Amino acid sequence: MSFQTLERERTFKNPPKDGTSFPDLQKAVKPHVDSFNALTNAGLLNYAVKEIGEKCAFDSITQEEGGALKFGNKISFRVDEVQIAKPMLSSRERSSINRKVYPAEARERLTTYKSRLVLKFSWSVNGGPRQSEMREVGMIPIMVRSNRCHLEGLSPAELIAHKEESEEMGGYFIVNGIEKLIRMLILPKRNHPTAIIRPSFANRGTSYSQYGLSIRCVRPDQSSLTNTLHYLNNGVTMFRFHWRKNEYLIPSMMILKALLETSDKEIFEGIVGKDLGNTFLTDRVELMLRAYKSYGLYSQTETLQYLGSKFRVVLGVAEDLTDVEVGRFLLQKVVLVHLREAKDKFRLLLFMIRKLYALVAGECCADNPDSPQHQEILLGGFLYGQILKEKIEDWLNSIRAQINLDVRRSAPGVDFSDRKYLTRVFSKINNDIGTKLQYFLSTGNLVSNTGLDLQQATGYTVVAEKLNFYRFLSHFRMVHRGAFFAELKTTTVRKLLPEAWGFMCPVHTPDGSPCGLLNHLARKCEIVTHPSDVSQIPSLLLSLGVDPPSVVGHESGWGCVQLDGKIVGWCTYKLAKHVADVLRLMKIEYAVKLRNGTATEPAKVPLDLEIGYVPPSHNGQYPGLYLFSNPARMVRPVKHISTGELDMLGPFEQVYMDIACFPKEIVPKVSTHVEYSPTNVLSIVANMTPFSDFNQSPRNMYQCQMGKQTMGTPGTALRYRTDNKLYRLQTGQTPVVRPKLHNTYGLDHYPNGTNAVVAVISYTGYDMEDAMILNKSAHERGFGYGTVYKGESFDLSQKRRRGEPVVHHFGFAPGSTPRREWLQKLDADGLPFIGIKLEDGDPIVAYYDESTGQNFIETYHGTEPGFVDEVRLLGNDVGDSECQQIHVKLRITRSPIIGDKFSSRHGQKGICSQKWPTVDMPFTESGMQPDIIINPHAFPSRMTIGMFIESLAGKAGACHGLAQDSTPFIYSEQQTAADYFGEQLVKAGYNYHGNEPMYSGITGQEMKADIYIGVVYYQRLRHMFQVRTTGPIHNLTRQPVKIRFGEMERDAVIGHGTSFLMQDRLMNCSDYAQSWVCRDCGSIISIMSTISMNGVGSASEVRCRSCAKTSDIWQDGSGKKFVGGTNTTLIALPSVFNYLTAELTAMNIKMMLEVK
Amino acid sequence: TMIYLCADCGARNTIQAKEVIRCRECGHRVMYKMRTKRMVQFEAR
Amino acid sequence: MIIPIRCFSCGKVIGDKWDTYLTLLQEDNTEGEALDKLGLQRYCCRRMILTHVDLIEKLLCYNPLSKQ
Ligand SMILES: [Zn+2]
Ligand SMILES: [Zn+2]
Ligand SMILES: [Zn+2]
């Protein structure tokens, strides 16, 4: 492979008008963007609002023995649908062509990127009116590039027509200007009953035990709620769940007989109907039926009414209607919300308690919720829709509450037929929610009356920190488990349990405390987000050899098949595996058809569906076929080996699949799948690593974590970036050694370092302890040239607290103006010259008050010479606003200075120590000086052998002109890449071991030993002093205001036994003071200098008040004569002790220190 | 007055202090300041 | 940004040699070793005009003083 130059040039020169040149990137960000689309389209929100329902309000007449407390004027209202239009221009007309607002502008004017939000409100007057009307409830953000922005479908060309870079990605909501983002978080698996064993159960429900079973059941609008099965020691199971952030425990048997008009014999024959008289299952089930019988009732309706009458309070249901319908409300709304047919819910509850008991007796191994097996992902658009629906419902409940209080006062206006009344109440409630979503996206704090079945409730959003492009992408693709486990330091999930191969990268993970917690996805692993119809799945299963029974069609060796939480049939495990194989085969075959010319019918068997065939084994997972078609699942591709076609599966079949790593590794008759490539196991940044399969893994880990913090280009369209701090390096080039995907992924458009002439040699003596040297000449010649962009804005509204209108205006009050600094910097508008050098004590901008008519000023907080590259007059609003916001983008220069950090792409960080003179440097027989000298004392104990490999490869590819490919897991132990490059280089003419004979720069005569020289890719970091002789002292305690010395240092100095040094550093240098004391009374505050004795005469000899009562006598500042209190002396002591005495006197407790 | 640049339309606007801010020819509401000729001196390091 | 004249390692100026090397790959059908015709005997000042990114021809299409 060669560097695509003519491609790159005839790319840049003419931006493509067809489409994005780098589809892999758009695919890499595909999660969030498709989340947004599936939100707006794909009938997602309409499902949420429909399954919200409607709210009723009326005039309640108390029953007062009536039993049916009557009420006539009942209004039941609901929203028909949600309409999200494009973000028009600040909609209200401004006498201009009302156009759209591209997000670039929302970045510029530093404003959130919002679009109007419309509801279709519907009525009912307890008749059948149900007329409609649209209600605006504010404006909510929109994500970039998404299905409701003006940037989707756009080619890089018109993206350049706007001020977004050629390869815009989208994926962040622009709030206030700052790129916010919703992180991907891991949840358990959807709707699959998981087994659980955890001690935390038993200590709370003491009759319970750690044995348990749960399921996170989810509605069609993706609104999951959980409900756990608690197997208690007596034998019954409690049906835990959550509502109003509160746990609730109702006996399983209760809800069972309440679910279906069922006879207890039907229960017993469903639960254990098999192997008649299985000891454990029989006796436990009996105990359960009996313990419920103890108190419960018999028929279904009695239990329904009892339940409704028991739970009518926490329910926000219609108060007046009835009581049994309350129970049905429960049974429909909480128990198993994913399902709809009560009989089917009942069958599954049976299967669930059956599996639970099997787990009780060790007949099934414990499911691991701490494993990507039992886990799926939350997207952004999905949680966005869920919280949106939540606010919808709170809005409905608020307006219902307003109608209710409207009735309740006496009868101010009570006419649920006049639309005028509805207008009045609509105005009565706060009709903006868009600010609520914008608020959360700014904060992340999920303020909900219900946790939405989510452990943690804070920190839900990250900011798309564009410091570096890798930081960018990694921000998109990272996932996290939640600080609820971070507070827990254990050998728990923080471990890399080996179900991630090809799913989430092994090495790509920060170090420190959040090490292991947050892991990024692998390279190719996608998340299916668009479900499909599966009706032909039960049809095909029925035709295939299973059947759903009505009376128990179940026996011993028969396994159960699950369609994403719906029992559909049974078959022996041989039939189970055969069904699994034939079904995937149908899926793949119809896939290769629909992809190509073959007609694309509604897919019989779509690719997304995962066939979790679980073979049986003792003390293993509860065996059972498990078909899943739910979206939001981890799904990765490989090649099915029987055919030659694509194959997709998730982290449920992995643990049971023999997928070969290599076409070479396959052993026939068993291995049924082959990896596309081992590449497909790593993440993006970790994959973009020369010979990453060589260095000891911690090096690669530092490599990812630090390379995400590099001083490269953060993009191309910088001119219109309103960020706080960006970083750009001036002279960039692609590496000589690279993995191919660095060209594929279009990384040619964000170089992050250059290619240095590295020579490993212990020559100078300054480069130990990992240190490094920088050739002076190569440095002045334009080496890694750091350029910081620090962009500050100023705004006048903040200093307009209240009471007055806009008063300040930028510029100068007409008349006088300071020239000594201001007119030299400020142009005339109070705004500085474009490109004028500033310093610290320097005005930046000038506004004056109107009333006072005096000029104010703004100084440069920063403490390094900065210029100004551009100033921006932000239109404050829609229009008709004076310029109340200005934006200055200061450019700071940071050449490579002593004390800054460099690092190759192997975690080999170094520090610019001395910038050696270019002539005192050694040289090759060709003579070019080593631009960078590193030490040989860095490679042992760091195992960075891939560094040497990269070095040799660079030395070769540079000479020949080759873009050395270094993809991991190509070179075998047969021929080492060492030998391959050794051929390359011996062809170049250089040494085969990379050595080269060098002459000492300082002595001139050659070294006894050849020296290792190559061409590494070096990027610069950005992580890179306060003197205080004296200064301000504190207000209270006269301390130098906020360097630290003490409280561990004290141990040090007293360890040396060096008292004078201690009293010197901590008393003398800190706070030294003279104060008098009354020697007799021993108090330090009753002292006072005597007052007005005579003329200047002698000194005013201080005296004591406590020790007191013509020359001896004296007076007071108020004139009170006194006498005595003579014995007074002067003592040195730190003033902070004086402060202590003060605040201790404030307690009436005081010490009486004496003196000699 | 002051002379600025309509961001999109690219049109000199000649706006004055205490004024509604927008492009006069196209209506845009974001404008940069032009770079006047101002003596600045640099070292070559 | 622009091709960094006076390469780091070598002392040879190269800033002249960018478009003259570009229209060698472009229309001369020779591979990167056209730089051998340029006279970069070393590899040091050689690896610049080889793997230099000329990003600035894409940054320049961002004049807000485009008047259009
Ligand atoms: Zn006294
Ligand atoms: Zn305009
Ligand atoms: Zn050179």
mmCIF file with all atom_site columns, N, CA and C in Angstrom, chain A residues 356-373:
data_model
loop_
_atom_site.group_PDB
_atom_site.id
_atom_site.type_symbol
_atom_site.label_atom_id
_atom_site.label_alt_id
_atom_site.label_comp_id
_atom_site.label_asym_id
_atom_site.label_entity_id
_atom_site.label_seq_id
_atom_site.pdbx_PDB_ins_code
_atom_site.Cartn_x
_atom_site.Cartn_y
_atom_site.Cartn_z
_atom_site.occupancy
_atom_site.B_iso_or_equiv
_atom_site.pdbx_formal_charge
_atom_site.auth_seq_id
_atom_site.auth_comp_id
_atom_site.auth_asym_id
_atom_site.auth_atom_id
_atom_site.pdbx_PDB_model_num
ATOM 1  N N  . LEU A 1 356 ? -36.612 -20.761 38.156 1.00 0.00 ? 356 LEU A N  1
ATOM 2  C CA . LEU A 1 356 ? -36.171 -20.298 39.465 1.00 0.00 ? 356 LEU A CA 1
ATOM 3  C C  . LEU A 1 356 ? -35.964 -21.469 40.410 1.00 0.00 ? 356 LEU A C  1
ATOM 4  N N  . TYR A 1 357 ? -36.944 -22.364 40.477 1.00 0.00 ? 357 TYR A N  1
ATOM 5  C CA . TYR A 1 357 ? -36.798 -23.530 41.334 1.00 0.00 ? 357 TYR A CA 1
ATOM 6  C C  . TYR A 1 357 ? -35.643 -24.406 40.889 1.00 0.00 ? 357 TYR A C  1
ATOM 7  N N  . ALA A 1 358 ? -35.509 -24.636 39.581 1.00 0.00 ? 358 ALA A N  1
ATOM 8  C CA . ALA A 1 358 ? -34.362 -25.392 39.094 1.00 0.00 ? 358 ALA A CA 1
ATOM 9  C C  . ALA A 1 358 ? -33.068 -24.788 39.608 1.00 0.00 ? 358 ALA A C  1
ATOM 10 N N  . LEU A 1 359 ? -33.006 -23.462 39.659 1.00 0.00 ? 359 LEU A N  1
ATOM 11 C CA . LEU A 1 359 ? -31.826 -22.801 40.196 1.00 0.00 ? 359 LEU A CA 1
ATOM 12 C C  . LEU A 1 359 ? -31.706 -23.034 41.693 1.00 0.00 ? 359 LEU A C  1
ATOM 13 N N  . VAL A 1 360 ? -32.838 -23.115 42.389 1.00 0.00 ? 360 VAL A N  1
ATOM 14 C CA . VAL A 1 360 ? -32.794 -23.352 43.826 1.00 0.00 ? 360 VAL A CA 1
ATOM 15 C C  . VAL A 1 360 ? -32.038 -24.635 44.129 1.00 0.00 ? 360 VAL A C  1
ATOM 16 N N  . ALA A 1 361 ? -32.371 -25.710 43.427 1.00 0.00 ? 361 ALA A N  1
ATOM 17 C CA . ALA A 1 361 ? -31.787 -27.018 43.681 1.00 0.00 ? 361 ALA A CA 1
ATOM 18 C C  . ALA A 1 361 ? -30.503 -27.263 42.909 1.00 0.00 ? 361 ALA A C  1
ATOM 19 N N  . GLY A 1 362 ? -29.809 -26.217 42.476 1.00 0.00 ? 362 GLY A N  1
ATOM 20 C CA . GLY A 1 362 ? -28.588 -26.418 41.729 1.00 0.00 ? 362 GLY A CA 1
ATOM 21 C C  . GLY A 1 362 ? -28.769 -27.089 40.389 1.00 0.00 ? 362 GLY A C  1
ATOM 22 N N  . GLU A 1 363 ? -29.992 -27.141 39.875 1.00 0.00 ? 363 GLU A N  1
ATOM 23 C CA . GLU A 1 363 ? -30.260 -27.732 38.575 1.00 0.00 ? 363 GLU A CA 1
ATOM 24 C C  . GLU A 1 363 ? -29.932 -26.787 37.432 1.00 0.00 ? 363 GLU A C  1
ATOM 25 N N  . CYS A 1 364 ? -29.433 -25.595 37.736 1.00 0.00 ? 364 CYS A N  1
ATOM 26 C CA . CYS A 1 364 ? -29.016 -24.643 36.721 1.00 0.00 ? 364 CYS A CA 1
ATOM 27 C C  . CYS A 1 364 ? -27.924 -23.752 37.285 1.00 0.00 ? 364 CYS A C  1
ATOM 28 N N  . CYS A 1 365 ? -26.916 -23.451 36.470 1.00 0.00 ? 365 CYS A N  1
ATOM 29 C CA . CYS A 1 365 ? -25.863 -22.556 36.914 1.00 0.00 ? 365 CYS A CA 1
ATOM 30 C C  . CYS A 1 365 ? -26.367 -21.117 36.964 1.00 0.00 ? 365 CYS A C  1
ATOM 31 N N  . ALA A 1 366 ? -25.702 -20.312 37.785 1.00 0.00 ? 366 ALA A N  1
ATOM 32 C CA . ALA A 1 366 ? -26.118 -18.937 38.029 1.00 0.00 ? 366 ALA A CA 1
ATOM 33 C C  . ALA A 1 366 ? -25.831 -18.103 36.793 1.00 0.00 ? 366 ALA A C  1
ATOM 34 N N  . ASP A 1 367 ? -26.855 -17.446 36.262 1.00 0.00 ? 367 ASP A N  1
ATOM 35 C CA . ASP A 1 367 ? -26.620 -16.487 35.197 1.00 0.00 ? 367 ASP A CA 1
ATOM 36 C C  . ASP A 1 367 ? -25.679 -15.395 35.685 1.00 0.00 ? 367 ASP A C  1
ATOM 37 N N  . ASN A 1 368 ? -24.811 -14.929 34.794 1.00 0.00 ? 368 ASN A N  1
ATOM 38 C CA . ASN A 1 368 ? -23.894 -13.863 35.170 1.00 0.00 ? 368 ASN A CA 1
ATOM 39 C C  . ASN A 1 368 ? -24.375 -12.525 34.632 1.00 0.00 ? 368 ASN A C  1
ATOM 40 N N  . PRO A 1 369 ? -25.053 -11.706 35.436 1.00 0.00 ? 369 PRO A N  1
ATOM 41 C CA . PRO A 1 369 ? -25.367 -10.348 34.981 1.00 0.00 ? 369 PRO A CA 1
ATOM 42 C C  . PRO A 1 369 ? -24.124 -9.517  34.781 1.00 0.00 ? 369 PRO A C  1
ATOM 43 N N  . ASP A 1 370 ? -23.049 -9.851  35.482 1.00 0.00 ? 370 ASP A N  1
ATOM 44 C CA . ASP A 1 370 ? -21.738 -9.230  35.314 1.00 0.00 ? 370 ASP A CA 1
ATOM 45 C C  . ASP A 1 370 ? -21.000 -9.852  34.138 1.00 0.00 ? 370 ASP A C  1
ATOM 46 N N  . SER A 1 371 ? -21.626 -9.847  32.960 1.00 0.00 ? 371 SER A N  1
ATOM 47 C CA . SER A 1 371 ? -20.998 -10.382 31.763 1.00 0.00 ? 371 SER A CA 1
ATOM 48 C C  . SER A 1 371 ? -21.714 -9.822  30.554 1.00 0.00 ? 371 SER A C  1
ATOM 49 N N  . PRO A 1 372 ? -20.994 -9.435  29.496 1.00 0.00 ? 372 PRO A N  1
ATOM 50 C CA . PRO A 1 372 ? -21.663 -8.914  28.300 1.00 0.00 ? 372 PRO A CA 1
ATOM 51 C C  . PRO A 1 372 ? -22.614 -9.911  27.680 1.00 0.00 ? 372 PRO A C  1
ATOM 52 N N  . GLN A 1 373 ? -22.588 -11.160 28.139 1.00 0.00 ? 373 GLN A N  1
ATOM 53 C CA . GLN A 1 373 ? -23.596 -12.114 27.718 1.00 0.00 ? 373 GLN A CA 1
ATOM 54 C C  . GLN A 1 373 ? -24.981 -11.635 28.104 1.00 0.00 ? 373 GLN A C  1
#
